Structure formats: structure tokens, C-alpha cells
């Protein structure tokens, strides 16, 4: 499933554990859109923090 998420309003904390969790186990892809996140791009030396 390519599952598109727009409200992300209700959706129990519990329903989510499962979808993110199942994206994994079943190759599901969830497409999230009301997020807003900047995006740094550090080089392979300070790899993530």
C-alpha cells in the first residue's frame, strides 16, 4: 500500500505504532504531508547527532 496521510489528526497513537511498524514488515509506504521540517545535510564525519 502506498498510504497517503493528510490529517494525521485523530489516528490513535496505537493505530500509528502499527502502520509505521508495518511499513517495515510489509513494504508499505506511508506518505506524510502536514509535517514541516527543515533539513540539515552534514557530511560523513559528523554523521548524525
Amino acid at each position: 500500500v502506498h498510504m497517503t496521510i493528510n490529517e494525521r489528526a485523530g489516528m490513535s497513537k496505537l493505530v500509528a505504532d502499527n502502520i509505521i511498524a508495518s511499513v517495515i514488515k510489509s513494504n508499505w509506504v506511508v506518505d506524510i504531508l502536514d509535517i514541516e521540517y527543515t533539513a540539515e545535510v552534514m557530511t560523513p564525519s559528523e554523521g548524525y547527532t
Partner: protein, 49 residues
């Protein structure tokens, strides 16, 4: 077909077929719903109907 205690004479009969519950009916596992409240209290439709 038969008399039908009550819908017949008055002979108080002393023996019936009472149907009862096989075992206690209110034992633990009380329903419990999770609640998510809208996250904006300003974008709450309300309209229609």
C-alpha cells in the same frame, strides 16, 4: 400446548425452568476507550446538518 402458569388457574406451582447465567457476568476487563482531542480548536468543522 399447556396451561401456562399465570395464564391459567392459580395453582402456584413449585418448580420451574429458570434460565440463568452460567457464571458471573461482571468480572473485570472493563471497557476502556483512548481519547484523542482535536489539536486546533479553531479548525473544527461544526457546520453541516
Amino acid at each position: 400446548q399447556v396451561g401456562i402458569p399465570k395464564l391459567e388457574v392459580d395453582h402456584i406451582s413449585f418448580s420451574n425452568v429458570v434460565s440463568m447465567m452460567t457464571a458471573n457476568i461482571r468480572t473485570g476487563d472493563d471497557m476502556a476507550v483512548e481519547r484523542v482531542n482535536p489539536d486546533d480548536v479553531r479548525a473544527i468543522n461544526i457546520r453541516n446538518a
